[PDB]
Structure formats: C-alpha cells, structure tokens
Design a protein around this ligand. Structure first.
Ligand code: GTP
Ligand code: GDP
Ligand code: GDP
Ligand code: MG
Lengths: 116, 426, 431, 41, 48, 426
C-alpha cells in the first residue's frame, strides 16, 4: 500500500535504479508521530461502522482498460512556452476535457509548465 | 572465570548461532571434531568463557538451541560444525508456530519453557561466576519473538543481577517477508522495553546494502549475512578473552551508554569491511578505520543518524597500536559534528582496546551507538500496526488463541510513550 | 548498457528491419544461428548464458504473409519466436480500420512485450519506431502506439523513422487521407521524426551507384546504413560522443517543429570508389548538395534552421572545422537569423562495414546529416492540395466513417496542420 | 621525452569496440575490473 | 582465507539432490536423536 | 604538504583529466601499475599534494570523476593509465543531460550531487592542510556545465575560506559544437562570477592555431590538444611540488593577480613550443622564452590582447635559471609596450621561478594574463544569446524543467554589467 524510505539506502531502491521506467508510486518521506492507543473503526468481518466517513470512489479500483480510454489521448509533455494565448488555452481545455484519465490508476498526469 | 551462556531461538536464531559458533571456534582454534589444534598459549587463557571441559580434552559450547520444528535442527546438525553441540542441548517441539506470536507466547509456548529452563539452569549452575546471557533471535516470526520472550521473562526472575544482551532482527521496511510482522514486532518490543538490559537492532536492508556497496559481492548468501553479524557479536566481547591495554567487559559497555533504563536500543557496525578488489588501494590506519566506523552507510539498522542526535557511543577496538592516535580521532569527530552529538552531556564516546586482532587481519573495531534515530524505526512500526488494527485485520488468529484486545491497546500505548520520550531528549 | 528498443510496424518496418538486423549481426560478429563463431552488442542483443544473443526488437504487423518469410528464412533462429507479432486481417490501406477496429486487439500484446524488453534493460535511451505514412498499419496502429506509449512512459525519447509519401509517384489512392490524420496524433506524442521517401532514393541509386533497376532489397540497405550511423556513437568508441537525447534537443526548437531530413554521403559504387578520393571536405559538401537529398524537396527555397553531422572512420577534428568554416561562407546556403551557431558534430572511430551482395563500396570515412529546414512547407502545400482535391466531393469517406470514426475528424486534421502551415512561415520570417 | 609534437604512436588497430566496465546490478552501481581493453584486446 | 567477512563461497554451485535427513524426532514420547546413522544432505556421510 | 583535490566533470572534463594525470605521473616517475620507478630523490619530497599512500608503496590520485553518461568512463578506465584511479571515485548516473543546462542543474544532476558530495568530503577531510580544489569542465555540454556549477555552489558554502581553480573550455568563436551553446554558456558564466576565485579560458580554436602554425602538425588529435593544457596545469602549481629560488603557490599568484573580486578571468600560455624543423635552428635561452610567451599567437584563448590592455601579468619559470635576465626581460617589455599596459598599477608583472624543469626540457615557462581584451569573448556570446532569446526559441526545453523566464533576463543583466566594468577599468 504505502512505501517507506530507508532514509539512507533510498537511492538503491528507487524505480529507475531497479529498472522500472514507468512513472512511480509516491514515497512517504516524513512519518507522523501518534500518541496513545487507536480507536477501532471496523466490524469483525471487515465492515466499516455506520459513523465513520466513507470515500465515494470505486471499491474495486480505477484501472482503465484498452476499450475505455479516451479516443484523443492528451499528451504527457505539455509546455505552453511559445504558443499563442488561444492555442495554449485550447491545449489546456483539451487537457481538462477528460477528468477520468487524470485520476485513474494508470493516470497520465500532465505537467503544465510556463506561460504563453 | 566469567562465563557467557549463549541462547538461540527460531529459524533465524539457529542459522545465526551455527555461524557464530563456527567463527569463534576458528578464533580460538577448535577443530570440527571438538579437540584443540592451535598455535599460541594465550588462546587457552580464557577459553572457559564459551566452552566447557569434557573427558579426553574435548571442548563443548555452552549454548542451548530451541525451536518448534526440527526442520532447522536437521539442517544445523548436517552442517559443517553441527557435531560439536551437545545432543542434550537441543530442545525442540512437535508443532510449528506460523509467524503467530499468540501461538508461541500463550498456547504451545507454555509447555516448552519448563523443559528449556531445565537445560539452561544446568549450564548456568556449573559456572563459578557467570557473567551474563546472550540471545540471538528475529522479531519477524512466531518462534524467535513469540516463545523467545518467555525466556526473556523467566530467566530475568531467576537471575536478576545479570546482564542480558539480545541481538534482535527488527523487521525490514521494504522486504516484508511476513504480512503479520507488525503484529509480532509491536508485542515483542513492548516486552523488550522493561525486561532487557541491552538491545542490538539488526536490519536486513543494511546487511544487504553493506555487502554490495562496500564488500562488492555479487551473490551474498544468508551464510555471508550471518558472518557479518557473527564478526560483530564476537568483537563486542573480545576483551573478556584476550588481555589488552584498556579492557571492556559487557558491563563496561552497558554503564557508559544507557543513561536511563528505557533507552537501550543500539545501532551496530563493523569497521574494517573492505572491498574485494580494492585492498590494493586502501591504507590500513586507524584514522581511515575511524571514518569507516562513523560513516552512516556502515550502520546495521535502516535509520539515518543524521535525522537525530547521538546520545552515547561505544567504540571497542582490536589490535596492537597507539593510544593517542585513537583518542585524537574520538575528539575530532565530536568537535566537528556539534549538531549530531547531544548537547547536555559531553564526552559521549567510550573507547577501549584489545591486543589480539582477528585472524588474518591487523586492526579492527566495533561501533555501538545510542541514537535518537531509533524512534524512527518505532514510529514506522506504529503507523503500520495502527493501519492494520483499525480494520480488525488478522485478529481471529490472535483473539481465538486466548488474549484480550486490551493487550493490543497496551503495547502501542507503551510504544507511543516511548517514541514521545525519545523525542523530548533530542 | 545504453540500450535502444526497436519497433518495426507495417510491411515497410519489417522489410527495413530485415536489412537493418542483417547489418548489425555482421557488425558485431553474430552468425544467423545467434551465437559467436567485447560487449558492444549489449545495446541491441541480450546475453543468454548459453551463448545465444536475442535482439531487443519487435516485428508487429496485421497480415501473416510478410512475417512468415522471416520465420522460415535464414534468420529463423536468431529472433525470439514471441517477438514476431502477427495479426489475421490487414487494415487494407485504411486509417479507421487500423485505429479503431483492428489496432485495438493487438495493442494489448504489443505493450505486453514492450514491457518485458523494458524490464530487461538496465539503461534505456529511447524507442526507435519504423513505419510508413501511406500504409494501413503504419497509419493507424502506429498512432495508437505513440498515444499509448506516452501513457505508459512519460518523457522517454521516441525517435521515429518514416517513409514519407513521394510527391509525384505513390502506390495508393487513399494515401493522402492516411497521411493527414497521422500528423495530428504525431504532433504531440512524438519526439523526433526523420523522413525519407522512396522516389528520392530511386534517383540516388540511379545516378550514383550505376544501377538502373533497384528493388526494395537495396533501398532498405541504404536506410540501414543511416540507422547504423546514428547508433554507432553508442556502440563504438569515439573521440566525441553523441547520445539519442542530444540531437533530439538540438533539432527541435519549437513543439511543432520535429521534422528533420536525413541524407547520407558518400554513397558510390566500387568502380568509382577506386577513382575518387574521399576527404572530409568532399563528403561534407555532398550532403549539402540538393541533388543528394533523400527527401524530394529543394532546401534552396527554404533555409537551414538546425543541423547535425555524424562522422565515421578516419576523420580529424581539425579538417572538420576547416570544412564547416568553408560551408558557412557560401551565399547559396542560407540560415535563419536567430540561430547563429546552427551546427552539431559527432565523431566515431570505426569505419562503416560492407555486407555481401551490397551495392556500396568499402570506404574509410562517411558522414550522415540530419538537417531541419523550412522547405517542408512546400511539401505540405502539395499534400494538402491533393487531400483537398479529393475531399471536396467527399470521396472514399464512407470507408472511413463506417469503421468507427465520425466525419468531424477530417475537418479537425485539416484545420490543425493548416494552422501549422501558417506557423512555418511565422518561424521562417526573419526579424 | 614527453612533448606535444613528439608524443605519437602508430595506430595499428581495426576494431574500436567499447567495453562496459561500469554498470548497474539490482539497485547498485557496480565497478567491474577491466578484463579486456578497447576492441577486444 | 582465514574466515573473514566476505572471503567465503558457496558449496552448492552445481550440486543436486538437496534432501535432508530427519535426525530429530520422537520415540516413546521423549526427545532423542532417533538415529546416529543418517546421511547429511544428499547421501554423503557426516564427517566420519 | 598542502593538498589539492582534483575534480573532473563531463566528457571533456574526463578526457582532459586523463591526460593531466598522465603528465603528472610521468613527471613524478609513477608507472601505470601504481608503483614508483624513478632516479631522483626530489620527486618524493612533495608528492602528497596530488597522491595518497597505499599498501606496498602504491600511489593513488586525489581525483574524482563525475559524468552523467558513463560512456567516457569506460574509455578512461580502458586507457593506458586507467588502472591507477580509485574504483570508488567514479560517480555516474543512468541518463545523460543531452546538452541541456536545465537538466544538468535542476532535474538530472539534482539526485547525483548528494552521492558525489560524500566522496568529496571523504577526500577533503583526509588532508592535514587542504590547499583548495581544482575543477576541469567545459561549458559546451549539459553535465560539465549543468552540475559542474552545482558542485561549485555547494563547495563554496561548505568551505568558504579556500581556493578553487576552474579550467573552463568556453565556446569557440567560429564553429561551435552545440546549437544551444549560448544558452548553456551565458547561464554558467553567471554562476561563475560570484562563486569562483580564479577562472581560466581555454579555446579549442586557439588550440587548433597552436598545433597548425606554431607546432606544425598535420593530425592534431584530441590527445595532442589535451597535452598542451595539461602542461599548463602542471606548470601553474610547480612551485608547490618542487623547490625553487622564488616560490609562489596558487594563493600567492591570485593575490597579485585579482584586483577586484569580479576580475578573475585569465588566459594561459606555454612558452617552449617549437616545431620539428625549427628545433635545429633555435637555441633555448631566457629572451627566447619571454618572446614566445607574450606572443598573441601562443596564447590559449580566442582574444587578441592588442585590442585591449594588460591589466596584470603573471609568469612562472622552470629549470635551473638565472635571475638578472629574468628581471631584465620582463622589465624591457613593460618599458617598450607603454600603451598595452595600464598606468594606475606599476610593475604589472609577477615573477616565480622553479628549479626542476620538465623531463627532456632544459627550460620552460607559463603565462597567466588578465586583460580587458577578454571582454570580447563575453560580448560575442552575449549578442548570440540575445539573438536567440528575442524570438523565444529553443527554450521550451528549458522552461519545461521548471525554470522561469526571469533567470535569462538576470543572467544577461549580470553579464552586461560584467562587460561594462571591464570597460571603465580599461
Ligand atoms: N522504403 C521502403 N518503403 C516500403 C517498403 N515496403 C513498403 N514500403 C512502403 O509502404 C507503403 C505501402 O504500405 P505497406 O507498408 O506496404 O502496408 P502497411 O503499412 O502494412 O498497411 P497495409 O497495406 O494495410 O497492410 C508504400 O507506399 C511504400 O512506400 C520497403 O521495403 N522500403
Ligand atoms: N539476518 C538474517 N535474517 C534471517 C536469517 N534467516 C531468517 N531471517 C529473517 O527471519 C525472518 C523470518 O523468521 P522466521 O523463520 O519466521 O523466525 P521463527 O518463526 O522464529 O523461526 C525473515 O524476515 C528473515 O529476514 C538469517 O540467516 N540471517
Ligand atoms: N580541448 C578539448 N576539448 C574537448 C575534448 N573533448 C571535448 N571537448 C570539447 O567539449 C565540447 C563538448 O562538451 P561535452 O562533451 O558536450 O560536455 P558534457 O556533455 O558536459 O560532457 C566540445 O566543444 C569540444 O570541443 C578534449 O579532449 N579536449
Ligand atoms: Mg499493414
């Protein structure tokens, strides 16, 4: 679920160092310190209690298959440096048009950098 | 005169104890038969620390081996040095644990400790003045950490005024050999807080990283990992068996580190580990040996000392050399890192020297260090123990074995207070 | 450990790869069985400990009749059996067939195999994709290939080698329809895309190599020599190295400008190679000559806006600088005003190798030029003309609409590169 | 002597293959001992 | 090679038949080594 | 006894460092295996400046090798003198910069600076009295200029009261290797002016002029180009290693040589460079050395000092050498050249003499020159930078790594302020 840094051998256990060239799951750099025991929030079988807040996402996952991705996939390298104020607006609108691809488990996450 | 009774526990303890008894047999000159074939008289000066006397000049180790399954004891006996151990010292069981800490501590473990205490007491009463005990086990299992803390509890009542050292294999952040390893670790650390004199934390990340970054071995076997631990745990107690300029008993290394009874978790390290093909380039002098001690890459625990403050440091040396060349280096590391050494006490490095080096080597040292970076290991276990205990995951393997849920709330509340108490001394 | 994954999509990509991997085996000393009779082969071959070498390339196509020659030919043992991906029915010179219907059942298996080669690699420089614009698989399935590869890999280099449609001669009727709609996908999902066309290589082989009738066998050898000249800096020791990332940065100044031209010099027969000396100055003016272009367009109408030179063999850096100082003083060669230092050079030691049955000669030194010009704007005014001239009466559009795409994409793809045509003159006008 | 003009040697070489003595294994940068020179010599 | 850390090699580079003898077991509900005459790993004798 | 730690960065920095360590080892009689094979005793009096001891009388260089592409790494290791470097000093990543200063300074070089700063600290704290650092890099690339300036800015913060020399290969006037070279060079000179004590400008076109006209060679390979600059580097620090009659180390020169902290851009030159045919017609004498030294042909940068004024001049002589002719000749050139020298500083020339000449050579000299004529190097690349920057070209490869567009405007505004203060000190 959550990766934890070794804090001195973290360079030896990164993604590209372990030969994985796709984008990465995040790593927890800092650790919060608790205090006292923890309250119990679930049933014996694993059901959540009626009083605890519940997320509204899909309980199975957010993987998006071949036949479910958008037909016009936005690119992963987006720089609005030398473009006009209408062309860059069209590209960022094309980026914004499909929220399903951005928050998916695969999740092409563009990095919009610069100004037109 | 002063004898050390060795204890093993679990699969990890048996394979780390068979390697340790092989190394110090070669250090003292003992053949696999059990006789003596050595070179110098001074190896017979203090040989009763780890060996007994038998008829016909045979030396048997003073160790006990416990497990729930004889599968590891079959491999130990069939190994290279398995014929030296006493056949009565093996105490095995009929049913396994399953990395279930509840099984090893409550259900099956109650019927085996009364047989183990019958054997360790026979090895302890023979000594005229026993020095202390040792325990090598792992916290990721149901035998070494489940049943092994019953031996922690029961021996302490019988022998209160003795020093007890544990070489505990703490769970790893990224290996994760067991799904329920934060459940076993949290309950085992809660026992080790108030019922243990000294604790040495060993992590498998640091054992893999040392053997690749420094020793440059392509294929490290667990036998090689045990060799690094065995060289460390034999260099800690080297002053009891060889005479030097400034000796250090295990009690000496306990007085000058822990300032409070709740702070005894250490970070080991071994200095002269040099690369396989780079001994032509290295120069073997104690300033080069000192900077390899204090390097954060040489630590045997996955916790960076730079995130915290050095509380106290021990440095036991080995080899014939000069004294001001050692004391100057201890002064130099303190007066350059004023931000990593704690301010409310000076002089926080204890040094000692032994004369006889290890075989085939000139100089050696062993680093032991009390740091505030141990709170990082505990708070990483706490967040994994909390995240799995919120959703009642795997509780039917514990509640069905006869323990209340309040004990789970006790162990984290003891350990959260221990984390908070480490923080206020930083 | 500087490894590149080759993608050969289409009939053109497979037939290019047959000559390209034949060249690589002789270059490193590999028999067709895959074994030996140095580790420079490690960028293309993976060492199986039994002594076998396996290329890190995939051969993907939609018809079985082009790859079944590979499975039975003389290199039937070198290639991995599972690296030759074969469909059932071809796209049949269609974009919508190769994009929405037939390209989607194989994109699972291609990205499965590419993931396995990426796991094998310890340092990845980029992907080399070989396709042709006028085909069906090269038009359709490659558009999905670049779009999916951007999702799986974020910023990895995507070098592309394309068979551009020739101006006057071509082998298809709906070829302009296929070639408009591939630009729109490849503007944003491709890093660099070299172009060659079959007509210009026909003129080079006719005039220089004293051979009247070439086939696709001895045009693929010329293309293989260009790919070998690019990668030779990664493979062999050189006095000045060039990586795949370098001329990606050095040839693309703007996000819509990623269309450089590839030319090779010298390329001569063995009878004339006896009779001509080949100096560094004599080979650096041949690539600048408009008659030796491997794309049918005259760069005298345009202006050079970036350049890249790759030298092989016995070459001296001093004579390189004297040659470049000479070509900068010609008034026929024109550069843009915002690029005063418009050159990039690379030097490798090993001379080019010769293959049996080849048409080229054994030459000690050679050059490979990657030049980015402004003279492509006439090559897209013509190609927009013939797309328009058959789109006015809405011909062949029932074939595209009926496979899964609506009519609006044709207006989108024409409008996008019409704005790009106004973009090329906007860059081309000096301050 | 060791002068710019004087220092030259004949290059009797044909193969200029480059060895890979620095690489990565698992997550570590390994420094292999050079068992061969340039061009398999 | 005087048993230094790192100066050791495996003994199982090409060995097969990695069996193990059941040296330890129960006989008449007491803990004993059931048989002294059991082979080491693959059938080899145990050092005399 | 005052050690200098060598730093190499980039492909060009490693190809210039390999020849530099070949000429020093030949000077001190160090064979490629590592031992010492010489005939004199003065070679081992001061050898710790560049070399560290090892076991068995082996000597290892005090150098680090940094490159994002390990391609040049393998060529250095497989060379004639590739087994002398320490195997742990090689620092390398997985992906290159690709002629991009943004990637080399912010994105690709950010996760390698921490790994190389460990090795820099290891070599620097092992010195009893560290003289300073020395860096070989080129502004032509992305890792020589990108993280080379990153390593400079971290070293200056860690060791402020030290000396640091940079031998930077600034871009060529006529033919440049990189299209994006004005972007890489303007953004690196701005990082150099506030963070460097002495900087030397080496031009490849000037090196081409030496090997074509002065030396009369036909095949000037990069090994012959790198031999000329390696002779300059050894000749600058010859008073540290070899005793002399008037000694002058790096701090001794820079005090006499830098009048204001923004005036640290020098131009080197080697005196005894003769052709093969011209050798039979020339006698080596002190006026011959000082005549070829001040010649504008011989100087190793693409700036003509006839167009400017000599601000300060340094000369370091070698060999068993007289003193009256040394003082007489560098006085006569000052009196004859009344206009090429500034008038508000009297006696601009600083003199140093060493006793031990290079092998096979009777006499030698080295020239360090500060002139107003070096500002035409800055003006040439500033106008090319502004020519590319107005049209907003080639910099979507720069602002796509997070860098803002205001960095280029402040880099040029610093650089136009730098050329404007050279003018009013002319
Ligand atoms: N240079 C070169 N071009 C080729 C070669 N073979 C095919 N082509 C090009 O490919 C184009 C025709 O498309 P193909 O590649 O044959 O077919 P496809 O891409 O697989 O698409 P489909 O026809 O639907 O199967 C022609 O216009 C040629 O220019 C070759 O061997 N060399
Ligand atoms: N360092 C080291 N760790 C070991 C060795 N053998 C096992 N371990 C560790 O012990 C853990 C599993 O212990 P386990 O066999 O369940 O212990 P047991 O149940 O008490 O017998 C794993 O996480 C291993 O990392 C060894 O030889 N050396
Ligand atoms: N004098 C000299 N210059 C060199 C040498 N090697 C490369 N260069 C110069 O370095 C520049 C390119 O540097 P580059 O390799 O891209 O630097 P890097 O990318 O940071 O490693 C070119 O202009 C070359 O003229 C050499 O051996 N000697
Ligand atoms: Mg097809």
């Amino acid at each position: 679920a959550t990766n934890y840094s070794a804090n001195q051998y973290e360079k030896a256990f990164s993604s590209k160092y372990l030969q994985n060239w796709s984008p990465t799951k995040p790593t927890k750099e800092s650790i919060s310190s608790h205090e006292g025991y923890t309250q119990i929030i679930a049933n014996d079988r694993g059901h959540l209690l009626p009083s605890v807040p519940r997320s509204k996402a899909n309980p199975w996952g957010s993987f998006m298959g071949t036949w479910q991705m958008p037909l016009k996939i936005p690119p992963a390298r987006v720089t609005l440096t030398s473009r006009t104020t209408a062309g860059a607006a069209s590209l960022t609108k094309w980026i914004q048009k499909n929220p399903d691809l951005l928050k998916a488990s695969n999740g092409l996450c563009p990095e919009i950098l610069g100004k037109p | 005169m002063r004898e050390i009774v060795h204890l093993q526990a679990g699969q990890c303890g048996n394979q780390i104890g068979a390697k340790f008894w092989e190394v110090i047999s070669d250090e003292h000159g003992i053949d696999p038969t059990g006789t003596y074939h050595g070179d110098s008289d001074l190896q017979l000066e203090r040989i009763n620390v780890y060996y007994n006397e038998a008829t016909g000049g045979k030396y048997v180790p003073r160790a006990v081996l416990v497990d729930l399954e004889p599968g590891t004891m079959d491999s130990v006996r069939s190994g290279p040095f398995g014929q030296i151990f006493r056949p009565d010292n093996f105490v095995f069981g009929q049913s396994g644990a399953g990395n279930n800490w509840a099984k090893g501590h409550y259900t099956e473990g109650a019927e085996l400790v009364d047989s183990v205490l019958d054997v360790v007491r026979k090895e302890a009463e023979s000594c005229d003045c026993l020095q202390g005990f040792q325990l090598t086990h792992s916290l990721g299992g149901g035998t070494g950490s489940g049943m092994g803390t019953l031996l922690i509890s029961k021996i302490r009542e019988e022998y209160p005024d003795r020093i007890m050292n544990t070489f505990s294999v703490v769970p790893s952040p990224k290996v994760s050999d067991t799904v329920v390893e934060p459940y076993n670790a949290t309950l085992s650390v809660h026992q080790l807080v108030e019922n243990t004199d000294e604790t040495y934390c060993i992590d498998n990340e640091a054992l893999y990283d040392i053997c690749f970054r420094t020793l440059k071995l392509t294929t490290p076997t667990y036998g090689d990992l045990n060799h690094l631990v065995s060289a460390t745990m034999s260099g800690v107690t080297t002053c009891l068996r060889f005479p030097g300029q400034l000796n250090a008993d295990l009690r000496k290394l306990a007085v000058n580190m822990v300032p409070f009874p709740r702070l005894h978790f250490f970070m080991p390290g071994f200095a002269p580990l040099t690369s396989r093909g780079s001994q032509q380039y290295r120069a073997l002098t104690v300033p080069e040996l000192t900077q390899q001690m204090f390097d954060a890459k040489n630590m045997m625990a996955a916790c960076d000392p730079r995130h915290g403050r050095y509380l106290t440091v021990a440095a036991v040396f080995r080899g014939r050399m000069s004294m001001k060349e050692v004391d100057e280096q201890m002064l130099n590391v303190q007066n350059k890192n004023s931000s990593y050494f704690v301010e409310w006490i000076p002089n926080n490095v204890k040094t000692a020297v032994c004369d006889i080096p290890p075989r085939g080597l000139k100089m050696s040292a062993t680093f032991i260090g009390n740091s505030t970076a141990i709170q990082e290991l505990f708070k990483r276990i706490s967040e994994q123990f909390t995240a799995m205990f919120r959703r009642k995951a795997f509780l039917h393997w514990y509640t069905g074995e006869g323990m209340d849920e309040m004990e789970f709330t006790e162990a984290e509340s003891n350990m959260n207070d221990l984390v908070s108490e480490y923080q206020q001394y930083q | 450990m500087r490894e590149c994954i080759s993608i050969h999509v289409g009939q053109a990509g497979v037939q290019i790869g047959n000559a390209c991997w034949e060249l690589y085996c002789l270059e490193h000393g590999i028999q067709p069985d895959g074994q030996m009779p140095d580790d420079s082969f490690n960028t293309f071959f993976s060492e199986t400990g039994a002594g076998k070498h396996v290329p890190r390339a995939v051969f993907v196509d939609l018809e079985p009749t082009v790859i079944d020659e590979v499975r039975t030919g003389t290199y039937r043992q070198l290639f991995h059996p599972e690296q030759l991906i074969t469909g059932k029915e071809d796209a049949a010179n269609n974009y919508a067939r190769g994009h929405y219907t037939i390209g989607k059942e194989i994109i699972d298996l291609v990205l499965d195999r590419i993931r396995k080669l990426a796991d094998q690699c310890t340092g990845l420089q980029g992907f080399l994709v070989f396709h042709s614009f006028g085909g069906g698989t090269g038009s359709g399935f490659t558009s999905l290939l670049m779009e999916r590869l951007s999702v799986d890999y974020g910023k990895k280099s995507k070098l592309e080698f394309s068979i551009y449609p020739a101006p006057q001669v071509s082998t298809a009727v709906v070829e302009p329809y296929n070639s408009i709609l591939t630009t729109h996908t490849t503007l944003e999902h491709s890093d660099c895309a070299f172009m060659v066309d079959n007509e210009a290589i026909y003129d080079i082989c006719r005039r220089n190599l004293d051979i009247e009738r070439p086939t696709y066998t001895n045009l693929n050898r010329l293309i293989g020599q260009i790919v070998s000249s690019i990668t030779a800096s990664l493979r062999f020791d050189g006095a000045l190295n060039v990586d795949l990332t370098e001329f990606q940065t050095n040839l693309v100044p703007y996000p819509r400008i990623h269309f450089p031209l590839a030319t090779y010099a010298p390329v001569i027969s063995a009878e004339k190679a006896y009779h001509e000396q080949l100096s560094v100055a004599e080979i650096t003016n041949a690539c600048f000559e408009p008659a030796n272009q491997m794309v049918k367009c005259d760069p005298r109408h345009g202006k050079y806006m970036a350049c890249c030179l790759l030298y092989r063999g016995d070459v001296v850096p001093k004579d390189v600088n004297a040659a470049i100082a000479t070509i900068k003083t010609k008034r026929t060669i024109q550069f843009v005003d915002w690029c005063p230092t418009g050159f990039k050079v690379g030097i490798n030691y090993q001379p080019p190798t010769v293959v049996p049955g080849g048409d080229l000669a054994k030459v000690q030194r050679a050059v490979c030029m990657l030049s980015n010009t402004t003279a492509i704007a006439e090559a897209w005014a013509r190609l927009d003309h013939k797309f328009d001239l058959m789109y006015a009466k809405r011909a062949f559009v029932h074939w595209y609409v009926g496979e899964g795409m609506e009519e609006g994409e044709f207006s989108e793809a024409r409008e996008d590169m019409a704005a790009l045509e106004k973009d090329y003159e906007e860059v081309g006008v000096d301050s | 002597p060791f002068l710019p003009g004087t220092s030259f040697k004949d290059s009797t070489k044909t193969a200029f293959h480059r060895s890979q003595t620095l690489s990565y294994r698992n997550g570590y940068a390994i420094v292999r001992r050079p068992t061969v020179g340039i061009g398999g010599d | 090679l005087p048993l230094l850390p790192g100066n050791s090699f495996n003994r199982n580079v090409g060995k097969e038949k990695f069996h193990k003898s059941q040296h330890w077991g129960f006989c008449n509900n007491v803990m004993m080594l059931v048989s002294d005459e059991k082979p080491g790993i693959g059938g080899e004798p145990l050092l005399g």
